Amino acid sequence: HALVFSYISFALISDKRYQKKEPLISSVHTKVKGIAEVKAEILENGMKKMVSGVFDTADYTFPLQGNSFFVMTNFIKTEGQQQGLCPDFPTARTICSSDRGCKKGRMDPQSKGIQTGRCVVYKERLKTCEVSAWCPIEEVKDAPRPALLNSAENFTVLIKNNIDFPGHNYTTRNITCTFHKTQNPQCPIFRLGDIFQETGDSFSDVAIQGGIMGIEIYWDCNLDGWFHHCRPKYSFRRLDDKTTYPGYNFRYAKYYKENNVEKRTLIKVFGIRFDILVFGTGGKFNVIQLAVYIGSVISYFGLATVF
Amino acid sequence: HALVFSYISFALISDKRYQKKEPLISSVHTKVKGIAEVKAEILENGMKKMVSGVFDTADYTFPLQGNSFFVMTNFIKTEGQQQGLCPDFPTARTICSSDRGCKKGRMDPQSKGIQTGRCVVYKERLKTCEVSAWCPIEEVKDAPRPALLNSAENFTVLIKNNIDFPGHNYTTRNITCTFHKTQNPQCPIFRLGDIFQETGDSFSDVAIQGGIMGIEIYWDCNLDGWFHHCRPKYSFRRLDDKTTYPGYNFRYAKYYKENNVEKRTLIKVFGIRFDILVFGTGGKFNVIQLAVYIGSVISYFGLATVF
Amino acid sequence: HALVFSYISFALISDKRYQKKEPLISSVHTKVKGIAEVKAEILENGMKKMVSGVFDTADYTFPLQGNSFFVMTNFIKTEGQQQGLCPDFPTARTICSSDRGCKKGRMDPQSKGIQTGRCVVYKERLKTCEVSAWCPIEEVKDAPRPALLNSAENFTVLIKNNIDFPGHNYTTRNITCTFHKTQNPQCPIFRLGDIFQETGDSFSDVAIQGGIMGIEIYWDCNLDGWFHHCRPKYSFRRLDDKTTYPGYNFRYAKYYKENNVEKRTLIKVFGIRFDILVFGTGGKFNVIQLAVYIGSVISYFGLATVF
Ligand SMILES: *[C@@H]1O[C@H](CO)[C@@H](O[C@@H]2O[C@H](CO)[C@@H](O)[C@H](O)[C@H]2NC(C)=O)[C@H](O)[C@H]1NC(C)=O
Ligand SMILES: *[C@@H]1O[C@H](CO)[C@@H](O[C@@H]2O[C@H](CO)[C@@H](O)[C@H](O)[C@H]2NC(C)=O)[C@H](O)[C@H]1NC(C)=O
Ligand SMILES: *[C@@H]1O[C@H](CO)[C@@H](O[C@@H]2O[C@H](CO)[C@@H](O)[C@H](O)[C@H]2NC(C)=O)[C@H](O)[C@H]1NC(C)=O
Ligand SMILES: C[C@@H](N/C(=N/c1cccc2ncccc12)NC#N)c1ccccc1
Ligand SMILES: C[C@@H](N/C(=N/c1cccc2ncccc12)NC#N)c1ccccc1
Ligand SMILES: C[C@@H](N/C(=N/c1cccc2ncccc12)NC#N)c1ccccc1
């Protein structure tokens, strides 16, 4: 009888059933900090090309969208594209053996053009299907072995989170320093390399193909006057698949007119997209809850006494 | 007495009250696949114009923002706009009868310019209020009868969802094939026409004015060791109003300098915006929950025996 | 005994425990309305400059991302930037006393360039560290005293919210008029000045540095056939910090080629970002819930009779 009561009180205190539970409504704002300089040479379209320059903050990041920001880590540039007819890039399914090899008015899913039914020569007696689209088509090329945005990990991000709860009627807002698991857990500025070290994923390896990382924030807050604890817990987990179109990459174009001719530049962007997740639990003691718990435990105690 | 107990156990098993319930934290990544070629001629500004060309993946879509992507289906192009003074486009409230007809320093909500108080001639003794803004103003014109992006329905979208739960400490990640309601429900690649066929909304009709469609995912997962079921359920529903500024459309500009003169191109974009929604329910059996349910049913059984 | 029963029924009716509770899944679409004309003169780079013109809808706003839109209120323009070497802008940590004062191959966090280790003269015997990046670097300059987008408050925004619930199997969709707290609470068109008047924050003061505002919507809906109440409640709260890199601002660039030379224009954007939040509570009466509540109150009544 007494043991059932002590265990009921201990379980109720451990689960905190007397305090009312409610979700948290958060609004996040992020500011990217740090710049990187790319000075690597990679051949393009059969010709060796040298790339050099520095990327400002606005060059490698977008504004926060849906409580999540993106950061570039690698890219493939294609300049001078203009609508027209050209032979498709050589692929396992793009090479044509004869003129009538390909089908007219057909567009493959992987191909970025609609075939006109003509077998043309891309380079030196190598025939692919004549396609109608942005010419020339971007070459199928793996991400560069060294991630162009090598200095991306040394970057530091600033995350400001505003918490609001309807029942509480309060809003909680979350020196230059880098967040550390134990030394400095309060610093809201994070080093990407520190995050990937938290998740155990190589930043240099992921930056080549791209990735999707998210920052999880847990709130174990209780509105009780006695034990008032409300501190943001920072947990990190990788959303990308790892094993592996893996990583994060999309086609982004910039259109310009040259010599009275419409032109477009297609850029394949590989990067890491961070999703800021805010999950919290609020608990403001309510008399009805305590009365319900007591009412439920009373029967258990009585049955324990009956045996 | 016995019937009340059997009904209590049957109801508890049907509602699954013994298993702990928790929400699901998801992160979605989408990749658009497919291209369309537009070769339609539509008159513009009183002159017949011919439009032809193919649109790549980067041309008709944006990067995923807020777990939702947008896909263009129709557009109205306006080129050569530059700041200055010009007569407003003829409308029910823009035509001026006399010079002093319009008010100086006034800007109507529907109008995109601030009137200077001068009644000018747009074309052939037709007078509208002189306005200061991007000139010339884009003409009020209905969406083209045939949706320019006819081939949009044949497109295929790839959706990858990563599920994470705090109490479970696990992450679940969700061949070229098209998803089917019964034949192939596992294929994560979707044909837009298949979605609109699921919702029963004509794609060709909606593409003209634009629309907002969302993909709902339901999770009826249970963490119990006995019955372990965790499969993503795909439900589809149209968020747009249908009846009807209906549809989805926004003004998107691209600024270029020509002949040492600042210029801007205004494009009215009509398209369908897909919102990926992830709703799930987790249930990991907890002793406290079962004890609470039993404690609540005990009183009901006793009262049933008392009668 | 009787008082405990009457109080139990009154408390159950007040808390509405018999009705099933469920969250709400919303999809929001926003359309910005109104235009502003900027005709202010502010000196730039030691030279007085005059700015004049009108901004269309597409100029000061982006498409809705993550159920939240952004509206510009102030900006700093920097034109002609091109990659190269140049002296950094004079700052407390950028001025070099001697040639060997600065460290080679070092980039400060606040600085947007990587120092080459050379002490150069920015203007008249004033030495800063030679940096490699976008040249010339944007000058450190406070936001203009008068917010360039003065007419932003007079703007009107249209918000359309679609509500969906899985258990209810229904979708609820939410004349030109401005929403008022009491006169016209149904008008879905909002005047920004009206919002900031609701939150008590000066719009003219915030527009200079920028801000983050959110529109909260509460749903106290009950699916009971007797008392069927389901009306959207509009509550407003400011997410920005106020006290204070405060406000909302980001670097946004536009790249153009001039005289066969790659060039970029960096624009520091200050604005207010509105986050549309949808929180609701659904309640469809369930027999199991009522039976549970009654079972929990029965023990309390019996104990009250025992005394
Ligand atoms: C990130 O910062 C670290 C220093 O905190 C850099 O490490 C140095 O790298 C240089 C070569 O660039 C070496 O000469 C130094 O010996 C390194 N020092 C340390 C302590 O590691 C690192 O190179 C930076 N990474 C990037 C991509 O810029
Ligand atoms: C989408 O694909 C279907 C085929 O799966 C196309 O249907 C064909 O259309 C052509 C005309 O372009 C007809 O000659 C064929 O007879 C059609 N076949 C079938 C099976 O429908 C359809 O035209 C495509 N739609 C778009 C907009 O490209
Ligand atoms: C917003 O609209 C109000 C009117 O509703 C404007 O107020 C007028 O401002 C002009 C000067 O531009 C004065 O001559 C009038 O006397 C004002 N009238 C009233 C009733 O206030 C206000 O200027 C507008 N604000 C902006 C930034 O355009
Ligand atoms: C804003 C844009 N950044 C861009 N940065 C470059 C600046 C100079 C030269 C470049 N060359 C190749 C590639 C990039 C650049 N260029 C564009 N557009 C971007 C960033 C992240 C993801 C997509 C797009
Ligand atoms: C990225 C952009 N796509 C664009 N595609 C075109 C490419 C060539 C010619 C065009 N002509 C008219 C209209 C479009 C185009 N042009 C721009 N900007 C876009 C896509 C979807 C929604 C808004 C904006
Ligand atoms: C789309 C863009 N608006 C822009 N509007 C201008 C139009 C003409 C002259 C300008 N001069 C200075 C500054 C702006 C402008 N220009 C660009 N890019 C924008 C809007 C809001 C936030 C970021 C970016």
Numbering used by the authors:
A (entry chain A), B (entry chain A), C (entry chain A): 34 to 207, 214 to 283, 288 to 350
From the paper:
The P2X7 receptor, an extracellular ATP-gated ion channel predominantly expressed in immune cells of the blood and the brain, is an emerging target for treating refractory pain. P2X receptors are trimeric ligand-gated ion channels that facilitate extracellular-ATP mediated signaling along with the G protein-coupled P2Y receptors. For instance, the P2X7 receptor requires an unusually high concentration of ATP (EC50 ≥ 1 mM under physiological ion concentrations) for initial activation, its channel activity is facilitated by prolonged or repeated ATP applications, and it opens a membrane pore large enough for molecules up to ~900 Da to permeate. Here we identified and mapped the binding site for the P2X7 specific inhibitors for the first time using X-ray crystallography, and demonstrated by electrophysiological experiments that those inhibitors allosterically abrogate conformational changes associated with P2X7 receptor activation.
To confirm that allosterically-bound P2X7 inhibitors prevent the turret from narrowing upon ATP-binding, we obtained the crystal structure of the P2X7 receptor in the presence of both ATP and A804598. Consistent with the activation mechanisms proposed for P2X3 and P2X4, ATP-binding brings the dorsal fin domain towards the head domain and pushes the left flipper domain away from the ATP-binding pocket. Altogether, our data suggest that P2X7 receptors undergo unique conformational rearrangements where both the drug-binding pocket and the turret in the P2X7 receptor narrow upon ATP-binding. Although the lower body domain in our ATP/A804598-bound structure does seem to widen to some extent upon ATP-binding, the turret diameter remains locked due to A804598 binding, rendering the accompanying movement of the pore-lining transmembrane helices insufficient for channel opening.
